[model samples]
Target: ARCRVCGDTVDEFLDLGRQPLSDRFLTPADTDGEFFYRLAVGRCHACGMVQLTEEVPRHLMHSSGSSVMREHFAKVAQRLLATELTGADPFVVEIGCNDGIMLRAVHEAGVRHLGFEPSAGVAEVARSRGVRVRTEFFEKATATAVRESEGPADVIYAANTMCHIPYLESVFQGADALLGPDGVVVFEDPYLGDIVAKTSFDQIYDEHFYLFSAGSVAAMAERFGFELVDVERLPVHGGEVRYTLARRGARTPTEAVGRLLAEEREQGLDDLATLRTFAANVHTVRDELVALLTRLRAEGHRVVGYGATAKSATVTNFCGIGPDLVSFVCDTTPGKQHRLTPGKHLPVRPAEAFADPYPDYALLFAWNHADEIMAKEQEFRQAGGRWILYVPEVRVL
Candidate 1:
């Protein structure tokens, strides 16, 4: 596969085998023709970008529909308003604004905001909240159009959306064309440094085209006449780094940027040897998880899965775990409930199924939300329910 950022060929390091669209849940009747793609990842030696070998088509739709994340989005909007968007007539644009959750607060604050949302259902919800939304993807062409009509944007921001896009050249071009001279571009995504440190292989999915690092992201911004001016570590989504970019020499980079870059170098984030070692660790995780689940089933203990998440698709499919190992997966999502897991075809039920006849062990796919899930489902813990986590290590607790 060629590097999405640069034209250089990507040296393949790890392959998760064939995988389905992580967010694409299937109804029992519609499981006959599920979409599959070769799920592999590699590094661009020349450009130092880590990306998937193949892309899931844009025609397929996906969204982040988490309530906990909604609160996070609102907090981010409030921060942006207080700090960066203090101008009298500041214009802000959000790329891939799912449901306008972030901009809902901005709209209430009477700020001029536009969300580039392609999903119709969520876009309509945004429109209802009085958030101006264009039902189009934000690329160079659309951005130029927006600039021509709405004037330049004061801030171009994206959260959890930038990594989903493989065609970043157009994104940078659009940002350059649409943003004001002194404007900044901000985006947050799962960090490569954190992924390697935790062996969170599930973070590599169809939507997550790239797992960005401070070092790689700095270079990517610099390549397009932008400077990485700021970087902040975020605890959400397992681990993430929020990157802020300004026009080259437009703003002085914070001292944190240099520190993060130094940390990346010390951790060997861009080194192929380090990535290959991470790949071996991912294999160990897959093996250990499968072995644990199988041993539990052999011991006549019911093992069920918690969190019918997109990330779970990678773990279950890669490890060849199915209903035999996990009786079913429990989720709070109605849309995912009564459906089958992608590729592996495990049954999915509502969260109540997890407790009606509490399984002896529950494989926790949403380990990032462990605190939230555990707090709400404490009764299960009291009932001798053990949670099995695979991140960092396959452990039964």
Candidate 2:
């Protein structure tokens, strides 16, 4: 497939076979019309963008923020309020404000904040929080509409939502019309560098059309007539790079941006050979994980999955893991509970089920939140329960 950003051939790197919608949890009765797409990763030499070769059509979709993310957003809001948004009639705009977690602080501070949210269940929640929300995706038309009624935005912030958008031409045009003279559009998403470094191939999902790096992002922004002014690596969401874009000459490129760009170059982020190595590593992980799970079952060890996360669907479906090897998955999220994993359709039970004489081996699907989960479920480890983690490598601890 062609690179959506620049009309260039996207060199195929890795293929993860057929995959279903990550969040489309289903019941036993509702599995008839399940949708699936070929999951393949490719990189465009022209634009330096790493994206899926086959994009899941517009029909199918869509954060639970831990304390780390909450604090992260709060700190961002506080800094912007104190600095950039201090001018007269200051306003803040969020590109994809699911449930308005970040804008709650902006609203409480009496700043004019508007959220562009398409989810009905979520827009109502943000509205209840007193944050003005427009129930739509932030494209050129919606951006222009908001600018006309709400006025120019001082800050346009998108948390964990920008990479989901492959048609960024519309977003850049929208940002141009919506932003004030010095306004910056800041967004954070899973970084390609981090994904390759950790071999977290599960991050390559349908919704995540693009995996950004400091290098690719800068190149992409330049094409849209925006300068990549600042780059910040965030620890939240496993690993992410927060990119700030401003009108070409509006802001000076920060030293951090230069350092990150150099880091990507030195790490061979653009080298096809490096990506191939990463893909080979992914194959090893799948084999190691499947063998371990099979051996555990044969050894009379009971195994259950922890965290029925959306990413977990990737691992389960790709590796052909069903309830045969792992009995069921346990999740704290009420909605995912009582449902089944997407493609493989593993049973998901309430978190309480995990402690009902816990399994001998637990697959830690949410390995990114390993620290927080390990601390909270300390008793699991104390009682001779081991966690099965596949990220970086297939290991049990």
Candidate 3:
């Protein structure tokens, strides 16, 4: 497949390989018909975004998988906007606005905003919050329609999304069309530099089509007449980059851009060495994780998982552990309460599973949001459930 961002033809396709759908969303009945897809990673030489050569389609990624919109995003968006130049009346819009948590923040700040979310269930939630929600994907047509209805947007934002779409050209066109002449496009997603630096292989689920870097993003932005002005490092999602895009020469650069770019270069984030190191570390991690779980099992410990998030599949599959090692996984998302995990075939039960008959320990797959998850599960801990967190470094909380 040719590179979408750069228009550079891909002469070779490198297979980082395939795996079963990671998020727990299937049962024994469902697992009887399980499936896996190719996860071929390749480079776009023209632009630098390292991406999968093929996509498993958007529906397969989000249909049964959970994309919860937490209130914490409201706070994050407020701070993120404060750092940017939104001018007098900041009119913001978020593509894939799962439940308008951020858009509500914009409204609360006395700013007007709109949201585009493809998922009907998610879009309804945002609408219920009094946000102007549109039930559609953020394509060129959608952008044109939005502009016709509400005029141009001052800031267009994408949070944890904007990485899955294969055709970057369309997104760039949409971003350019929708933004006001002086408007900016801001997005926050897992940083490729941090993924390498921290060996966060669990983030490599089917939904994440790419791992972006400032080097890659800058290249993509320039092609669409936008300049990469700021890059903020967020501790959320293990490590992430909050990128700000402005009209080619209209905005001044932020100190963050230089700091993060230098950080990436210093760590050789774009080189094969970094990728190789990540692969090796994951291999070692797989062995150690199994050993640790095996030790816990031998001690007759009853182990369950705290959150049945999609990323949990990466951890369990990579380690080759299954229900024999750990029992059912639990999560706070009501939609995923009774569904089974996509692979590893674990039951996705309710958080109340902890209260009824709590296990000796619980693996925290959604540990990226450790503070929030822990706070929500405080009742479980009070009921004697010991929680385990495994990112940034492994620890029991």
On a 0 to 100 scale, what is the lDDT of residue 228 in model 1? Answer: 96
Q: Which stretches of candidate 3 lie over 4 Å from their true place?
A: 7-17, 22-24, 62-71, 76-90, 355-358, 371-389, 392-397
What is candidate 2's lDDT per residue for 1-397, written digit by digit as tens? 7999987989999999999999999988999899999999999978889999998887777242466777877898897789779887899999888777788889999999899999988889888878799999999999999899988998899988899998998999999999999999999999999999999998988789999998888888899999999989987777999899999999999999999989888989899899999999999999999999999999999999989888887898889999999999998888888988899989999988999987899999988888878888878888999999998899999
**Model 3 lowest lDDT segment of ten:** 62-71
Off by over 4 Å in 1: 62-65
Ranking by lDDT: 1, 2, 3
Give the Å shift of residue 294 in candidate 1: 1.2
Cα distance off (Å), candidate 2, residue 182? 1.2
> Which scores higher on lDDT, 1 or 3?
1
lDDT score at residue 159, model 1, on the 0-100 scale: 92
The C-alpha stretches of model 2 lying farther than 4 A from their native spots are 62-65
* True lDDT of residue 262, candidate 3: 88
TM-scores, all candidates, are 0.97, 0.97, 0.86
Clashing residue pairs in candidate 1 are none
Residue pairs in steric clash, candidate 3? 23-310, 24-340, 24-341, 24-342, 25-340, 25-341, 25-342, 26-340, 26-341
Name the TM-score of candidate 3. 0.86
